[PDB]
Amino acid sequence: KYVLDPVSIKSVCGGEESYIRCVEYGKKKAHYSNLNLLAKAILAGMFVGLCAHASGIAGGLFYYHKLREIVGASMSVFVYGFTFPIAFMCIICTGSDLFTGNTLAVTMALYEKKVKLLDYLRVMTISLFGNYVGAVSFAFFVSYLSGAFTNVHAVEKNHFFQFLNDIAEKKVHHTFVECVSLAVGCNIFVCLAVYFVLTLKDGAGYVFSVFFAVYAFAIAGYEHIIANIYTLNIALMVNTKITVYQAYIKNLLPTLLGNYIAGAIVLGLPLYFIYKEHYYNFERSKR
Amino acid sequence: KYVLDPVSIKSVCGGEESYIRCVEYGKKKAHYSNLNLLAKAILAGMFVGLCAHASGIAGGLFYYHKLREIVGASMSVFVYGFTFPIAFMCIICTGSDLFTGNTLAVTMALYEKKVKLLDYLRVMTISLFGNYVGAVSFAFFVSYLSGAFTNVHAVEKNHFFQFLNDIAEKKVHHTFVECVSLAVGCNIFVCLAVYFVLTLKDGAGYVFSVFFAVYAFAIAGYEHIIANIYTLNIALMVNTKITVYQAYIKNLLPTLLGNYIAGAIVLGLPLYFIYKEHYYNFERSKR
Amino acid sequence: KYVLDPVSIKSVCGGEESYIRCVEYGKKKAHYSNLNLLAKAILAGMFVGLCAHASGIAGGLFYYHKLREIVGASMSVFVYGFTFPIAFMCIICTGSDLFTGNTLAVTMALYEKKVKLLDYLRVMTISLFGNYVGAVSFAFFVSYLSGAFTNVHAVEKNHFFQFLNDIAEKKVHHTFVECVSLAVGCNIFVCLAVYFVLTLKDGAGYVFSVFFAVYAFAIAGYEHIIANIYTLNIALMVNTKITVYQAYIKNLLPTLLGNYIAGAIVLGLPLYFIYKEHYYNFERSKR
Amino acid sequence: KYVLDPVSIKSVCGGEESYIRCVEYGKKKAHYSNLNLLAKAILAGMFVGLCAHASGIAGGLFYYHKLREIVGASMSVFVYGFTFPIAFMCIICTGSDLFTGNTLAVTMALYEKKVKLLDYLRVMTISLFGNYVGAVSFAFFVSYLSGAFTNVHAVEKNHFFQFLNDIAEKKVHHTFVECVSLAVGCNIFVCLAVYFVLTLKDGAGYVFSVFFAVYAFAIAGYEHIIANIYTLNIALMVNTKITVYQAYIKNLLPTLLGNYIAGAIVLGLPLYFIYKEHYYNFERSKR
Amino acid sequence: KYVLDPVSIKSVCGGEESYIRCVEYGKKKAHYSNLNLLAKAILAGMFVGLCAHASGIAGGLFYYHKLREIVGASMSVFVYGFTFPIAFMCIICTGSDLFTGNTLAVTMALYEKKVKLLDYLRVMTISLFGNYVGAVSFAFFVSYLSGAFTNVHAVEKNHFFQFLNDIAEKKVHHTFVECVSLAVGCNIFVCLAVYFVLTLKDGAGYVFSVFFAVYAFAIAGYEHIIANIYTLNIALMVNTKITVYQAYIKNLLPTLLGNYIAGAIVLGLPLYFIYKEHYYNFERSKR
Ligand SMILES: COc1ccc(C(=O)/C=C(\O)C(F)(F)C(F)(F)F)c(O)c1
């Protein structure tokens, strides 16, 4: 028995089904308890700190001073962006939640009247607080205690500390408008990667769409709030030239503002106004 | 219970089914309202500007002057072409429409008498205008306001502005025939990538066929109208050596002409004459 | 409701089913009309010229003279072989036909008495003539008119013309036996990639098996007749040191001979003698 | 007959199903006999030693002294991390078990009262002992007897021994807290890769999720107990500057402690407390 | 009609099903006739010679003397290992058989009493002889006659011959124990790649698992008997410094011994003793 024409399948969907899946995934978040949501947020912040530690080491390897005289920072930023996007798989496969992707899904669930306003506020607040706690706890308990980013003062050995120092100094000397714009550019890629895993239901789609999206915002110099929380806190721990005021006021607050603006307004409102009738037709056919 | 011979599947189709899917996807566009189509076009232009900002930064990293003395522009153009093709996934997963892919699908729907001429004209006009608006709005509100491409005048720091300046000067000193030929070569790859996502219905097919196609036209020096709108407008904003007349007359108008010629004539008419009887047999079996 | 053991699938087949699919795909070609087959052949030659233009530009970028003093031609040939294999996807997704893959499938359909001899001759002749016409038409109307491979005489700018010149001079100074052997080595990879897309029915199989096969013959220095038609004609257009006699007699005729020998004899006759009883059992079970 | 809308599939699952699959896979381990479990553990340790030999050779190739003066150790560590992750596929496709992944699955099966404490202890002990035996047996019978890492004393030829020596000296001069932190960071990636293969049921998911995870911990400098057993034993065999006391007390014992802490506590307890009600609902619906 | 939860699939299997598939695939080989098996073995040896020619050219490109002064042999061996693993797809998609993978499957079919001893001996003998004949016939009729590896005596042009000469001299100066150990390390990867294609039934699994496995043994310096037959015979043809006695006694005989030992004993006996009861339960449920 020979097979000539096998069964035709597909693992992709259209934009209407992807919007409906996004609204359903966003409205499922408001039904968990506070401790379940908090533990998920802490785990996701810890995974972000894990992959950003691995990225800092992989980038600081290519920040060797003789190579840095020839190529500058190009290979270090490329290898950082190459090895960072596994954090998306770490978060999605454990079922945890991060604030940056929530700014689209839970907000569009709020637009479709699936989540009330107080439930929306507590979901976003618990998500941001738990992501912060997981990021700083990985920054101290693994990254600081392993001594990987310690200043060792010799130029042929200090490329890990020098890469962390130069990255932390670069992302702390923007103005307010510049940091808001870079954070907007980051969270558009992040929410699009959430749309990618809601659309493409295979392992190849999951791995490589979010690989190219997360690598793309990483090499662009765009600003991610949870990654910046980890990076600026481990920079403050190992005594980089930045200040606590510089890290929290000059980077973290406009990064939070720009990430929320890109999630809730730049992407959430146009997609809601494009696809709300399809969610209406989906909800009427279930009655 | 052990499985020795699993169920045989396929996620690909033939050329006849791919043509029929292209005509159906093209004729669905003329049934949306004007504001739905306009919002989709603005979102697609914004995504093009997003990924082209990320590509300009990733390419300008490898345009460092000591590396530029050794390798020229090769690594910068390669890294640009590597990080650009995620815009296709950004456009297809949100259900938005871009003019360059529309020049094949809506035109072959017009050839098969599925779209009237006035509907075809308003679909193409609204698509081009919305793509323009989204591209210039990302060029100003993110790219210009973040200061990423500002001339900083020091040769060890100015590689982002110098890469944008050299790219903008290169794509503005073609003659008319040269720019039309390069735009034809671009839109053939673009419409083939649209055929790829109409044929290969997995995440791997979606990601990597359009990766290789879009990278291929990006490294070839071929001219894309929406990408050129973003690039020449952000070049005009940060005071590159190009002129407004040079950008709009010497590049953008022959790029528009060559892109439409490749979409509607070079690819649309041969595929229509090859496969119109299969669309006839498909439409007769639905009666 | 939780899923622990999902449905077991497969997207691959055995050698018997792959042979039967090859004979069926080969015998479908003799039932198209002459103009349908001619338009498909012209489109496939045009796609080959498209991807070979993109490969020549991508390779000539890494043929920069300061990099060429250090690495030679290695990175240019690697980047050429990296960016060439998208032509296979361009040909298969539009349903067009190229002569090199036809030398296996239509010949094994002739061995199984599915195609008569005159039908076989007109299919192969129309395929070769249309592939030639599409290749030279892309060489003139896009590649020559865009000025991408023009001799500009300055050594820091002339790397595109110099790469085309050195490639065209290398593939024109073989003897007859050497060119026949390299063409045999090329068409074995080409017909194996046709077997790969007949066996592996996903997007990942389609993209990456023919990626590794086509990259493998491209970096090996093996000779492809349609790619050589494009390359030697664009080399003759931009006034490379080669002669018309050298291009047509010293390369193109032994490349045609070696490609047909590898398709019809080296691969077609052993696979026919191995698997003809399985095609007999397949054809008897349909009665 | 044309197919326009194929059958929609998925090869991924949610976090609840992934937790349930993890608990089931962990509780299946306590039902094998002692010799079956011992042979599986010996095979897995042998596969780890195989892929780490291949990684040491691939890394020592790029540790050539003239390249080492320019780039340092960056390309060697990158090529090591590139070629190491095939060990995961070697272990999963033969059905063998490694201690590092067991510290999550069997421990969460113990938390859900599926495994008794004495059965848990003998499973973990037999796993660790067999993994040790397989690693040292590959270190002697293949790696030492092939002479690949012998000190040959000439600086242009000694890059394999020098890479093994520098790696072994680097991972033996940590303090206790540093080694525990790096081992925690390793086993979080390892247990996440186990979650990846429990979630993504295709070949692409299997290959590339664990590729990016295992490459990520390899380039980060994180400490894996079985890989360190192989590496420090082959370093002791070929007379690297390290001591037996240094290898066993300064690296192997805190690596074992940190790997068990990351598997059982950092990842097992939060996932258990998040998802134990879903395992309760799964187990009640089977009655 | 919108799809929210598609049908859950999987393309992977467990270790028991993979063992059963291996025993069935191994016992199918003893039912072919002698000429069918001989033609399959000759085709597989020819494919090995094809991909090893392409690998020798791709590696000798990066063996350019100015690059060789900086990086040594690292990039040449990496590019060789990158472009070699397409031979596995060439062999599996045509249904042919190679000796190295047969040493596991046919031997475990012999352990399960599915193949008699004389049938086992003639299958292994015909496989080895046909693989030899195909390898030497490709070495002469394509590789030698194309002149690609001819000594041209000028150091800026002789990198192909110099790469072949240095590889052939390296793999001929091992002792007996060293060559046996390296051959064992090779055939473990080869038989694991056979297990990979028996387990992962997609195109992505087929391409990339055997890509990473075959690249891993290629960059490790492990010894493959059929690849060494091709390489040492083309080295003897183009007058490399090696001798016929050195090639056949110092490399080929211990490579054959180590490959058979790794296939039949190191991997076949533990997997047989682990999984023979599952094959018993599979065979009893078919009665
Ligand atoms: C559906 O499961 C998920 C998975 C990922 C995210 C997410 O937010 C990811 C990022 O933000 C990120 F990609 F930038 C990084 F991981 F790097 F931090 C999420 O919100 C939900």
Ligand SMILES: COc1ccc(C(=O)/C=C(\O)C(F)(F)C(F)(F)F)c(O)c1
């Ligand atoms: C079916 O959904 C789509 C997706 C993409 C396009 C498209 O046109 C894409 C480009 O033009 C592009 F690839 F060049 C880039 F994205 F880079 F701009 C489209 O028309 C329709």
Ligand SMILES: COc1ccc(C(=O)/C=C(\O)C(F)(F)C(F)(F)F)c(O)c1
């Ligand atoms: C089944 O659809 C196809 C697809 C491709 C070919 C083919 O022949 C391809 C080449 O020859 C090639 F790979 F070398 C290149 F594309 F580069 F030219 C074919 O014959 C039929």
Ligand SMILES: COc1ccc(C(=O)/C=C(\O)C(F)(F)C(F)(F)F)c(O)c1
């Ligand atoms: C389900 O089958 C498996 C597969 C792999 C592991 C495992 O533990 C793997 C590692 O630890 C590793 F990735 F670090 C390396 F392989 F490199 F050693 C396991 O526990 C169970």
Ligand SMILES: COc1ccc(C(=O)/C=C(\O)C(F)(F)C(F)(F)F)c(O)c1
């Ligand atoms: C099931 O179909 C197959 C496919 C491949 C092999 C095989 O043996 C492959 C190698 O040995 C190899 F990977 F090393 C190379 F191909 F490179 F030679 C086999 O035995 C059977």
